[PDB]
């Protein structure tokens, strides 16, 4: 009974509503639209600048304290559109309700993919790891206040830009913490503390007795030469650390070197908490890639422009003990500042009036910040239509030092 206009409109509407509903975490990540607005279907490594940190400049005359300072960028890749290419059987088009059901089934898979990607990125790339042997409880002597600890370590480190941070609980610890669901919709939103069932489980790390091999100092570099010979920006979101052995290391592991402590990001004062890092790639048997680059305050090699980016009191030393923080399996609780996660989406480049056989419609989801396309085409082989829903987006954990992981019950 449906005509072509309904086939387009109902489908786009249902996609937008169900993707907006199923994703409570993608709506908290900052939406970043690339200024390029490229018309080509090529995945470009978009380089977003980060906030500029400069040394203290004092005095009337600033000729010596020159304006020249370091500028760093981070990279995001929008790989390929997450498609769902299926068939529109005759039963699906019988009435509006069945068509909504089919389109909702497709866009539910798309939304679950988005949510899994965001949750896994936050859990495997968060650096503000806070652990407690106790479990999360509302108020008890042997209970852990995850929100209070997260807020304290976010404020102490000066990572929040004074507009607040967003905390995400798995449903179990959300119920344990005592947050009520009444007067609130599903996920705990107000129709900010939320709960998401997509939060993964961070498995324990079997690695023991790892030590840092040799003295290692990391410098925030702005550019490097590629193979063609042109200067290319360097993603300062990662650092490669040579260890004694990386056996048992995995992408989700959280480590913290002994004797190495945070600094206030702006004030550069030593914090109580030991410096926490998350490994992102075990590139070699000895080499591992920890997320937040450890830039030491007391490095003589660092120039003041480079030293302005320090986030660690002392550099890595030889035979420095590495402490693994995720000693027990526990479903993660995550939190982050305003810009700690960015969802980069660009409209899918396609023109609709050219080809009569295939009918494409471009839609946007402003609540989440995703750009997609919706295409339908007849098929004589199956005597029905083919439907395709695309979603071109890319998620970036820019400023991974501002993403935190709450790990309760680390008794082992």
């Amino acid at each position: 009974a449906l005509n072509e206009g309904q086939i387009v409109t109902l489908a786009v509407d249902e996609i937008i509503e169900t993707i907006s509903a199923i994703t409570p975490m993608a709506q908290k990540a900052k939406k970043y639209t690339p200024p390029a607005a490229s018309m080509q279907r090529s995945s470009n490594t978009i380089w977003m600048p980060v906030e500029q940190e400069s040394p203290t400049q004092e005095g009337w005359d600033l000729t010596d304290k020159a304006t020249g300072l370091l500028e760093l960028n981070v990279a995001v890749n929008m790989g390929e559109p997450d498609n769902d290419f299926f068939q529109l059987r005759a039963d699906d088009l019988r009435d509006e309700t069945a068509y909504r059901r089919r389109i909702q089934s497709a866009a539910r898979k798309l939304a679950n993919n988005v949510e899994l990607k965001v949750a896994n990125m936050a859990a495997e790339m968060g650096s503000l790891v806070i652990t407690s042997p106790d479990a999360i409880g509302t108020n008890t002597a042997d209970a852990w206040n995850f929100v209070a600890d997260a807020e304290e370590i976010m404020f102490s480190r000066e990572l929040n830009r004074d507009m607040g941070t967003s905390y995400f609980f798995n449903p179990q610890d959300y119920k344990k913490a005592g947050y009520d669901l009444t007067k609130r919709d599903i996920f705990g939103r107000i129709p900010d503390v939320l709960r998401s069932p997509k939060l993964p489980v961070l498995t324990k790390s079997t690695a023991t007795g790892i030590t840092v091999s040799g003295a290692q100092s990391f410098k925030p570099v702005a550019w490097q030469l590629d193979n063609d010979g042109n200067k290319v920006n360097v993603d300062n979101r990662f650092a490669t650390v040579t260890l004694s052995a990386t056996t048992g290391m995995k992408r989700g592991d959280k480590i913290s070197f002994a004797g190495v402590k945070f600094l206030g990001q702006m004030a550069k004062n030593v914090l109580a908490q030991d410096a926490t890092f998350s490994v992102v790639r075990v590139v070699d048997g000895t080499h591992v890639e920890i997320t937040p680059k450890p830039v030491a305050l007391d490095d003589v090699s660092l120039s003041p422009e480079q030293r302005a980016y320090a986030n660690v009191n002392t550099s890595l030393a030889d035979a420095m003990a590495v402490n693994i923080l995720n000693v027990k399996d526990a479903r993660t609780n995550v939190f982050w500042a305003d810009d700690a996660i960015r969802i980069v989406s660009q409209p899918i480049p396609a023109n609709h009036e050219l080809f009569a056989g295939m009918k494409t419609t471009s839609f946007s989801i402003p609540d989440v910040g995703l750009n997609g396309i919706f295409a339908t085409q007849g098929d004589i082989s199956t005597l029905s239509g083919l439907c395709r829903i695309a979603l071109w987006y890319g998620v970036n954990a820019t400023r991974p030092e501002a993403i935190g992981v709450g790990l309760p019950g680390q008794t082992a």
Partner: peptide
């Protein structure tokens, strides 16, 4: 009723193929 009318023009907009107007009228109905 009013809601029947709103359903009428949202159905007309859907038949035309304008997604944004259909969504706006659905939100008005809600």
């Amino acid at each position: 009723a009013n809601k029947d009318a709103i359903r009428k023009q949202m159905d007309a907009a859907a038949s035309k193929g304008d997604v944004e107007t259909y969504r706006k009228l659905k939100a008005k109905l809600k």
